[PDB]
Amino acid sequence: PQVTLWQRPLVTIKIGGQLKEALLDTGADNTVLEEMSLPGRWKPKMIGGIGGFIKVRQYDQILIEICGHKAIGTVLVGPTPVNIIGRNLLTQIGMTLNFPQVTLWQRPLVTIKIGGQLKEALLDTGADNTVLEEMSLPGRWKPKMIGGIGGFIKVRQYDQILIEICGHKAIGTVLVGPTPVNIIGRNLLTQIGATLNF
Numbered sequence: 001p002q003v004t005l006w007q008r009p010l011v012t013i014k015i016g017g018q019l020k021e022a023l024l025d026t027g028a029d030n031t032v033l034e035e036m037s038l039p040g041r042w043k044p045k046m047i048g049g050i051g052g053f054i055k056v057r058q059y060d061q062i063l064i065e066i067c068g069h070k071a072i073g074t075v076l077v078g079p080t081p082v083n084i085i086g087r088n089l090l091t092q093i094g095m096t097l098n099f100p101q102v103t104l105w106q107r108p109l110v111t112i113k114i115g116g117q118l119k120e121a122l123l124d125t126g127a128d129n130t131v132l133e134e135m136s137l138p139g140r141w142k143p144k145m146i147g148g149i150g151g152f153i154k155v156r157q158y159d160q161i162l163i164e165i166c167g168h169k170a171i172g173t174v175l176v177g178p179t180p181v182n183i184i185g186r187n188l189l190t191q192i193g194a195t196l197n198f
């Protein structure tokens with residue numbers, strides 16, 4: 001199927017004999033599930049996101065069915081607020097991002113122009129908002145806090161900002177603060193007609 005991004009791209013997964021919902025997340029390198037019961041050996045691991053880091057258990061060679069499509073790969077289990085299917089599994093179900101077409105064997109990076117400046121950013125189906133590293137933008141803004149996998153961060157909220165995403169123009173809300181990576185979230189992805197296809 002093809003999936004637009006006006007709503008979170010949720011799918012049904014089956015893993016460890018159990019059914020769950022998860023988010024198709026082009027911005028995630030790994031697949032991370034809420035605490036659950038899986039069989040077998042695992043290894044401790046630390047992973048980062050917005051907000052900081054979390055400890056998870058790493059299971060390798062796990063069979064997972066994603067909306068009926070089977071994949072075997074690494075699944076991390078720990079204190080995430082949302083089940084996320086990252087690029088490690090997305091590639092196995094032939095997921096593509098279209099807006100050109102983009103495969104997910106590498107991070108889906110694009111060039112953006114905003115506030116007169118060129119930057120690189122990550123096309124992120126798993127992000128509700130667009131969050132940029134600290135930068136100089138003109139105009140008024142409002143304080144705000146947003147959450148990610150490791151907790152929360154304080155950002156400045158700029159509304160009605162013009163941004164060019166790989167040559168495509170959009171106007172919307174941009175958040176600016178201590179993110180390690182520039183991320184383009186669904187609020188802007190819809191405006192450039194981005195779809196997921198698998």
Ligand SMILES: CC(C)(C)NC(=O)[C@@H]1C[C@@H]2CCCC[C@@H]2CN1C[C@@H](O)[C@H](Cc1ccccc1)NC(=O)[C@H](CC(N)=O)NC(=O)c1ccc2ccccc2n1
Pocket residue numbers: 025027028029030031032047048049050080081082084086124125126127128129130131146147148149179180181183185
């Ligand atoms: C999952 C993991 C493998 C660890 N990958 C990542 O976390 C990478 C890390 C990258 C480098 C650091 C900066 C962010 C990018 C993109 N992220 C993926 C990225 O898709 C990440 C996935 C996610 C979704 C929900 C909750 C937690 C995590 N999304 C986000 O961080 C965006 C940020 C935002 N507020 O718009 N968060 C959300 O969209 C969002 C939505 C609902 C929520 C409810 C409760 C708590 C937090 C919630 N966060």
